[PDB]
């Protein structure tokens, strides 16, 4: 495949969560959070992502019973058996802003934009390509490249030609404990937030591997001192021979 | 020395040792694991972003 | 040579070998083994057993 | 006698795991053995700990595997073990085969043991492959359906076997629902061929690094080669415990993530890297009954090796010239496992016929003109005339 | 039971092997002999002596692959590049 | 007051000696291409040049320069 239809590499960026004794940064993820909302909830449903494990993560206990009560789900129907509507709770899923595919497809010129739940797992890169992808639109494509109508210019995804269109802009969103909202600081902060949704169990599934890796690395040097313990009476052995008498 | 007749010569004693031994393993080397993994990561877990909402 | 006659062992054998000890410093490495592996058998257990218990989504509709 | 000789449970455990006979020079390649026996009883443990909470339904698939990484308690654990012990099956088991080769284990008497490592070695591929599809994701999907759609190649019978496979006429909820209940049984096939495996093996003993009799000097396994196999027990879930915990989805591909959609195809359409040197070899011929005999043959041609080995001493050991072109040959599976992961663009087109033609010229011509020259070459380097 | 077939090894006492004689083994017990005694220079100059010999066989079939993999793969990406368009359009035709 | 991080430091890097010479490539493509495609019949060409290759060296020198230099600066 040519360079251009194979997209552009996306590079090694410093993640805080790289490495492997690091936790994510969860000042950085409820900062990531505001950016989803006010940014791509109006057309990127989030459908794997309990409201409960936000609790403790990024947010307390109080301010995701004041955020799942903005929302509305379907109630089991009343005694009559006509449908109705309740306020969301702690056990519901993040509501997508769309009720069908042909909706999502509809309002973005065919193109159904994708779910967001896993999407640092199911690309190329990680997040070092869904960071990259956000900054990485130009001012205008270079020279020869004929775009369709309707569709937007980055080099990092596959084709060059994208539908989704250049969203961060500097200090569109202003964060709660002030922090200045360019656009790589909200860029960087959706993409530490959605890699806490497609892996929750990142902060603890790095700490039970240092729990692992030194019993089973403490486990296996022992052990060569056990095989080499009970082998000294092998790996010592000594074979003399002398011919016996050849009149037999 | 003397730490054979007592420790190493019944095995049902060997072995009371080993699980013994291993109770105390189990919490000791977790809470000293837990309590290096938040302090070599101070400032970016839950319990320090909740105090800087004051 | 005669079968009496044992060849030169003297490169591997111990200074001294008090059985007290010898069997102290190998009861160790046994059981330091073992203390790891019964620390290392229960989280294997607990990870199968407790997998089977109530699940997230349960707990949050109780 | 003794009790655990005097059993009739206990004398099975003895003569195969504590008074068995081993030669006292086999070096650490023969632990091969008991880590497949490791590593398959985590992917059977991790299997129904795991098949407790999975919904076979298209679509419930790939939903409920989500569910199991996010919901059940210790569920990253149990699926991150069963990806990757899986791919950490096939690199002891690809491992164990090359042992096999090097050194001579395949001659007389112990041809029956690999025609039986042979048919394990296909009930694994098989399982790996139905495992695969339970996930239900892109490259889930989209593998089934070009793997599947090979068997409409078979003349006359053909599209009546892939619409049996399917159960419809594509790869739909039939098919998913199918390959789920035939992966849950495969290895339970497996594990009753491991038996079938140890007792082929157990009238003849196991060969040893030098390709000379073992009867002379035999240790037994007990306090021996139990704490020998205890060295790479603790080695194996090492490299596993780096692959679970600290970096999980490196072996796997990113696209099994998103959701099966049969109405998109992927870019690179790519089954998982095991299967990939079997995937260079079904590219490479430019037909489609062909391309299927010549994946299937590609398996079937570890049959022909006993009797095409000339040599007539046994194994590598001690020869140059088949000891070189062994790893000609091990350098030539990682090759075509690397064509059978880029795209069918020049020159791989022809890099992939060409190592396909030296997968297939070594079992046939290599070694039976190479084990043909050492045997002559031994011969007049020490008897003079 | 039933009987079985002549094998190539039999059992502790009748392994089938031929007669020995005159050849006798020495070895001392393990509690009374230092493991791990000789971990340097054999990690040192026996490892040494092993890679000395072995190597000449996994080097030069991997020097071989690998060169013509790495001659290959800077070969597709230069007919998919700019400069190669022209050479790209006489070999897939 | 503050501007972007990331575009702080393109137009650091793109000053340089090595910046300054893969732009004056992008921009040898891109007026050839240019004075190429106000050509009469260039609609009804079998292929046209673009300077995607050339804009490929200039956004890889920048951003494997700007890859650890970035992430310090945001808070
Ligand atoms: C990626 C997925 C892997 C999953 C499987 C995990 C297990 C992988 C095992 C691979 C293997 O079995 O290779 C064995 C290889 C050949 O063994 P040999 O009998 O010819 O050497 C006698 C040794 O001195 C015994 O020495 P000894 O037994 O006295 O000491 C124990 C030794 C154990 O080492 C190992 O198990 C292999 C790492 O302790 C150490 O020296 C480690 C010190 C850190 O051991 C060697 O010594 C290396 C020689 C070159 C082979 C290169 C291997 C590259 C694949
Ligand atoms: C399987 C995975 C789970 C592993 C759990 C291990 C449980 C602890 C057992 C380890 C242990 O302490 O082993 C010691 C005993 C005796 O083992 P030993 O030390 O070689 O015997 C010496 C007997 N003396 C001289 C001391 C009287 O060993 C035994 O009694 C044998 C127990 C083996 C269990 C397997
Ligand atoms: C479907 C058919 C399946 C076929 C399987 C395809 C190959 C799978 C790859 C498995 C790798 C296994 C390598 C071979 C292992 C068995 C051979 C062996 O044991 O090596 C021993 C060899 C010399 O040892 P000796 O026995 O001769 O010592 C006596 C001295 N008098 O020691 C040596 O010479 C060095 C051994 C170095 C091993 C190198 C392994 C390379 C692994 C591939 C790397 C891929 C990334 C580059
Ligand atoms: C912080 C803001 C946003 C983030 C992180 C985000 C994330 C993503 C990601 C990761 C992709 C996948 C690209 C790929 O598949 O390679 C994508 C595609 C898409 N996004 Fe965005 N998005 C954001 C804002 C928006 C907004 C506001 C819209 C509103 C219309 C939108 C519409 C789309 C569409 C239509 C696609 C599909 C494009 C295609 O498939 O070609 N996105 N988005
Ligand atoms: C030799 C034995 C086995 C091998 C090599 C094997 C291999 C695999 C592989 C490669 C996958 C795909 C994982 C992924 O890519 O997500 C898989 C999935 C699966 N396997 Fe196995 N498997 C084996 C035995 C079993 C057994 C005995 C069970 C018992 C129920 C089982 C249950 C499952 C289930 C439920 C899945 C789908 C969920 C998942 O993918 O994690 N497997 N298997
Ligand atoms: C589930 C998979 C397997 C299991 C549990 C298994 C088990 C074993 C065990 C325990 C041994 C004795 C240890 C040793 O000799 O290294 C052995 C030996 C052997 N296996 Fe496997 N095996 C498996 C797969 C295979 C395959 C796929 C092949 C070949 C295609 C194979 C061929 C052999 C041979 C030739 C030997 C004898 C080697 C010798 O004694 O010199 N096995 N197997
Ligand atoms: C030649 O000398 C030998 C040798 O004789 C042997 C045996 C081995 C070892 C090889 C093996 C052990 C391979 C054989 C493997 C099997 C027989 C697989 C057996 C595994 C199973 C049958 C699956 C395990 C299933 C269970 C334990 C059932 C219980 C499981 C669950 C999940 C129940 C859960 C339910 C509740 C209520 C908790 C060697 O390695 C070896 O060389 C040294
Ligand atoms: C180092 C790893 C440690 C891990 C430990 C876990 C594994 C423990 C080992 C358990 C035993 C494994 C091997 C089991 C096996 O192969 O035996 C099956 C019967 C084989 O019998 P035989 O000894 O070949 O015949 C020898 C005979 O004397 C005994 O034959 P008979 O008993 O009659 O056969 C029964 C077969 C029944 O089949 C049918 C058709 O009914
Ligand atoms: C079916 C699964 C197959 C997996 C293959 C596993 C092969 C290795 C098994 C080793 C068993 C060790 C028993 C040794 C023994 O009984 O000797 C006993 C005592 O040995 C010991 O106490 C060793 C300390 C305990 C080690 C515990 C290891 C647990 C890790 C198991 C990991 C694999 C499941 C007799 O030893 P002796 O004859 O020298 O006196
Ligand atoms: C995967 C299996 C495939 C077939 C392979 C068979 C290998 C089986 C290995 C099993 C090892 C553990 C068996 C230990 C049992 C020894 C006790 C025994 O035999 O004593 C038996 C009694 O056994 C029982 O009561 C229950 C046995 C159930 C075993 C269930 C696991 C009595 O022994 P005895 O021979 O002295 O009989 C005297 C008669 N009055
Ligand atoms: C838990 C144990 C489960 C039960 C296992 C034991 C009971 C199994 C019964 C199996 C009966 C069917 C097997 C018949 C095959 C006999 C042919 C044979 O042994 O020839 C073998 C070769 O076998 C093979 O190549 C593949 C055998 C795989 C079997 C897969 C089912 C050659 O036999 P042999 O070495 O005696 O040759 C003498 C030379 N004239
Ligand atoms: C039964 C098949 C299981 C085989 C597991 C081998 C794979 C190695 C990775 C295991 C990680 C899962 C355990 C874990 O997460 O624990 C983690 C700790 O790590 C360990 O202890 C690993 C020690 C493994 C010892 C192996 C002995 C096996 C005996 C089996 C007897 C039934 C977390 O423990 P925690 O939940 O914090 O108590």
Redesign the pocket.
Known sequence: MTAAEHGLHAPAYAWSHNGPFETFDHASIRRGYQVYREVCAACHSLDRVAWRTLVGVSHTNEEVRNMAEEFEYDDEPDEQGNPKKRPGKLSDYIPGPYPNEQAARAANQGALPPDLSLIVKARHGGCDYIFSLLTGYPDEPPAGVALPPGSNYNPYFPGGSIAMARVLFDDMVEYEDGTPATTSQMAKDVTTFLNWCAEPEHDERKR?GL??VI??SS?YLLSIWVKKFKWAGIKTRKFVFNPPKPRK | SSLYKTFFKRNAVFVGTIFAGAFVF?TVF?TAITSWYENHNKGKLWKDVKARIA | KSTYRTPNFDDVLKENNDADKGRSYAYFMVGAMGL??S??????????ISSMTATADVLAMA | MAFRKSNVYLSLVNSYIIDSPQPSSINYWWNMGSLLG?CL??QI??GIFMAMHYSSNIELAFSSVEHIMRDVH?GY?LRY?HAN?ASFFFMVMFMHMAKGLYYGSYRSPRVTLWNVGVIIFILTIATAFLGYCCVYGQMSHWGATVITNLFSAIPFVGNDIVSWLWGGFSVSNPTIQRFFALHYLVPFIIAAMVIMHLMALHIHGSSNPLGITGNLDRIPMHSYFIFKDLVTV?L??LI??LF??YSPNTLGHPDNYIPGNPLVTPASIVPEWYLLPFYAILRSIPDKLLGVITMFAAILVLLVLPFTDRSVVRGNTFKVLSKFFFFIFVFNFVLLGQIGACHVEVPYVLMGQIATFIYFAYFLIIVPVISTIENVLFYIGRVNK | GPPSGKTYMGWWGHMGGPKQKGITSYAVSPYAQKPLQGIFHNAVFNSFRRFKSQFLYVLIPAGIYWYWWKNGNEYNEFLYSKAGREELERVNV | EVTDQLEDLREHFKNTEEGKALVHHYEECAERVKIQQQQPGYADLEHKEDCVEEFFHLQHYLDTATAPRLFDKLK
């Open positions: 039970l729990k692992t019993i089973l486990l | 189990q977790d | 790891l592996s620390a290392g058998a229960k989280s294997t257990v607990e990870t199968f | 490791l009883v985590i443990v991790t210790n654990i073990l012990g603790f194996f879930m596993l415990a679970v915990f």
